[PDB]
Symmetry: C3
Subunit: 144 residues, 3 copies
């Protein structure tokens, strides 16, 4: 029961994020300064590159990244998660009622045992405006 490894982070201008996330561009997030909301095991850890997967941790991972930036209600929020040669994306139309976006994924991750390569990379933006009032949550859990 439960999972062997998991990491949940809260990313904001106050907790490790850029003072302003540029519009219409996807630059991977430095998560070293992110606030750890919950941590399980030691297989998943935050770093300047994203979320590191410890050696020997190949398997299935459930990942979710969400964002709310209530002061930006136009354009589309673009979200992206990368691991190795794979990248996953989604675009979420903004509105006052939905001032943000969400991306969730269940994927298989092969861990080579090379720290700089075995890392989940995260990024998002709004295609029409910079974000400087965002609350981003990133959670990853090894389910097998």
């Amino acid at each position: 029961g439960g999972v062997t490894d998991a990491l949940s982070l809260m990313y904001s201008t106050s907790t490790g994020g850029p003072a302003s996330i540029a519009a219409n561009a996807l630059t991977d997030f430095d998560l070293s300064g992110a606030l750890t909301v919950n941590s399980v095991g030691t297989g998943l850890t935050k770093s300047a590159a994203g979320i590191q997967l410890a050696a020997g941790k190949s398997g299935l991972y459930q990942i979710t990244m969400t964002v709310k930036n209530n002061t930006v209600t136009t354009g589309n929020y673009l979200l992206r998660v990368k691991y190795g040669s794979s990248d996953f994306v989604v675009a979420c139309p903004a509105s006052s009622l939905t001032a943000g976006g969400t991306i969730s994924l269940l994927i298989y991750c092969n861990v080579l045992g090379v720290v700089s390569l075995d890392v989940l990379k995260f990024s998002l933006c709004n295609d029409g405006a910079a974000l400087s009032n965002y609350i981003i949550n990133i959670t990853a859990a090894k389910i097998n």
Copy 2:
């Protein structure tokens, strides 16, 4: 193997939902009358407020809410899930082929032991028309 708590519901005009979900607005759903499709354990239960998390159930939760309302193929379906001070959203462009939307999340939930506060709240609508022919499925499972 398996999860300790889970709840899967089917929400419609015949099973607890409003006769008509207003357009372009997000009013949290009363799930007391929702049809229970599957239930595991007793940590997650349906209520007029949404889905209650029993005391002592802090942890990671996988959540999914989907909707199909085939007679509304225009505008954007707006979906929202809330827990405590956090809210998660997504907008899904409608079409005849995709007359609805989907929102899935893996999040950490802190349970304070205050029933009225420890509740997952759900809501959705179409930003251009009311929904009165919808099939909404909401499933939550505690994975850690």
Copy 3:
């Protein structure tokens, strides 16, 4: 710890997919030729119909289907997953930064013990152009 059954596939023109996925239409995918990236247990297997659920495997399933087709950056990527009488959809606006889409679901699956009926069906397209340079990943795991 871990899941009892899971299947992760990589679908492309080189690994079982159509030479060209027609625009604005959703025809279920023949996954018999998909590349198996990871397999756990024997409850979930690829077939010409989609992903078969073995008899006695009723329960909760976490499903994700993603697509990247970098040469198609316009219109909306439409994704759909079906099981029995239920269908789940999402539309994802394309862009150069998000040339694809994502759909993830946690749903309850009742297995009748009728192979042709107990199958997860998958489909996607772009509503404005055919796809002939796609990398589609489909992963399903029985979590309870």
